[PDB]
């Protein structure tokens, strides 16, 4: 029909929204073992019984884990079996024929979910759909046990039955490009933002201080992040797949772990730096020189390199479970599978250790400020808001991820992958917030103004 826009009128795209794609065996809202896209394996409470039925369906030993090719093949087999079930029934076909293309799909949806004989149970609802009494059948279907158990999916199917359009599912496409344009802005803010910082310290001589030498490091880790990590990361999420190969999958992963670790550990260095620069400024100016500070930065990148490129390129970070082995064998799969060891080891070094130091240091700052050689002034209240933003932002961005990252492995995943990738991006945008936190100095202000002549 000359239709190559994104969304179309079909049962296939409809079910994919209702039933997510999961390669490993899981349990539905009922509790039955299911794999792929809503493919029921068995009602048997035994997982081994589900594995046997699964291996008899695929034709090989799957270990409860299949591939995308096998998932799609089962999906079309199930949809075809749903349609062939509708056509072979006495109650379904008289209704199915008398339905438009859209409403036909809505009927297949129910059959895809609760079987041929189950949907035929709806004597009243089907008669009403047959006499084109949509609004009455919409109300009647909302009184079934199918509605009480899966109210979200039912409400969408019932709506499609009512309107006769894809209004309940077409709202998914707006969010597709809707989050794409957001990612498009995130990349720009990080790249252009950190380049501005680096350019300022590199050009102007007044911005060449020890603290700013640490700022340069932070701006460097965030820049590469916005040039390597963030773009390639978004490029896959939108396209649903990874189209660069296995070699660049881990290399891009290596850059990720590298830059993120270097970024957070630098935030830690800056925090300690500003402690000594304030608490003991006279010793701070004498002890810590540019040479010494260059050694500190070098140490940070080595630690970051030791916890990123070193384990990854040596396949040490790799997990062993069947779903991980497949992705390591797949050229289109670049998921981040790790073992308990690397997941904890990285998190402690990348996030937790700097987190502890940054909190303890900034606490001492608020502590040793009360004990000085000195009555309810507002200069201390404003300074309190500052550290609340510095530390609060870093917390609100990375903490949700690394907590989940540690829960992601302590037990078999009860936390959705959708949440896992989302919380990584909340950490990703911290690399954009940094220049808006660590470059508000009057010297940076004047530098930023002249760098673009505003």
């Amino acid at each position, epitope marked *: 029909d000359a239709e190559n826009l994104y969304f179309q009128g079909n049962i296939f795209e409809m079910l994919r929204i209702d039933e997510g794609l999961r390669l490993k065996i899981y349990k539905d809202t009922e509790g039955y073992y299911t794999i792929g896209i809503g493919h029921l394996l068995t009602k048997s409470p035994s997982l081994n019984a589900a594995k046997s039925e699964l291996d008899k369906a695929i034709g090989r030993n799957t270990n409860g884990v299949i591939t995308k090719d096998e998932a799609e093949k089962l999906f079309n087999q199930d949809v075809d079996a749903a349609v062939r079930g509708i056509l072979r029934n006495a109650k379904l076909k008289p209704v199915y024929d008398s339905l438009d293309a859209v409403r036909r799909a809505a009927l297949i949806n129910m059959v895809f979910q609760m079987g041929e004989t189950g949907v035929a149970g709806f004597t009243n609802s089907l008669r009403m759909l047959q006499q084109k009494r949509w609004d009455e059948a919409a109300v009647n279907l909302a009184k079934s046990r199918w509605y009480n158990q899966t109210p979200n999916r039912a409400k969408r199917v019932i709506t499609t039955f009512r309107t006769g359009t894809w209004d309940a599912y077409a709202a998914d496409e707006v969010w597709v490009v809707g989050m794409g344009i957001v990612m498009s802005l995130i990349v720009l803010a990080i790249v252009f933002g950190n380049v501005l910082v680096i350019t300022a310290i590199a050009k102007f001589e007044r911005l060449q201080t020890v*603290t700013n030498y640490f700022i340069t490091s932070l701006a460097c880790a965030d820049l590469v992040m916005g040039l390597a990590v963030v773009p390639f990361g978004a490029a896959c999420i939108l396209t649903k797949t990874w189209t660069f190969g296995n070699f660049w999958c881990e290399f891009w992963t290596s850059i990720d772990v590298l830059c993120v670790t270097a970024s957070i550990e630098t935030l830690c260095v*800056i925090a300690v730096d*500003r402690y000594f620069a*304030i*608490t*003991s*400024p*006279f010793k701070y100016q004498s002890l810590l020189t540019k040479n010494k500070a260059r050694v500190i930065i070098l140490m940070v990148w080595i630690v970051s390199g030791l916890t990123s490129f070193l384990p990854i390129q040596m396949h040490w970070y790799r997990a062993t479970h069947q779903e991980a082995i497949n992705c390591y064998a797949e050229e289109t799969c670049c998921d981040f599978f790790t073992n308990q060891a690397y997941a904890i080891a990285s998190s402690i070094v990348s996030f937790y250790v700097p987190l502890v130091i940054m909190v303890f240091v900034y606490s001492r*700052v608020f502590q*040793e*400020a*009360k004990r*000085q*050689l*000195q009555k309810f*002034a*507002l*200069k*201390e209240h*404003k*300074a309190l808001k*500052t*550290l609340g933003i*510095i530390m609060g932002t870093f917390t609100l961005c990375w903490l949700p991820f690394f907590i989940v990252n540690i829960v992601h492995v302590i037990q078999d995943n009860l936390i959705r992958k959708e949440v896992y990738i989302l919380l990584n991006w909340i950490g990703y945008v911290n690399s954009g917030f940094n220049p808006l*936190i*660590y470059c*508000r*100095s*009057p*010297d*940076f202000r004047i530098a930023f103004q002249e760098l673009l002549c505003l």
Partner: nanobody
Amino acid sequence: QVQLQESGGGLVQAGGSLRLSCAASGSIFALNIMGWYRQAPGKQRELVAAIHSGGTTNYANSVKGRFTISRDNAANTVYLQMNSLKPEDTAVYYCNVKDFGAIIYDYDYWGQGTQVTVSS
């Protein structure tokens, strides 16, 4: 929007003693560095003496042993004892306050400046 009141500068004979003063009127963050800077005729602005809010001090290599900096107990007023003055100490002494309320950086306050002349 705070103020700095300088006082003390004047004419003295070579070797004579002089006392400077700088009252910091306004609200300053607890952690700070008050001190003094000078501009000798035909020379860049140099650090004379500076005292942190934590009592510790710092002097230049050309004044250490002759100049003694100190501060009041609660009035935020820094006094600069200047003894055994030299004709090369003749300069424009500015008052200075390093605020740390921004944590990441340090905002600077300055004074009107005082003229100190030593008759060679």
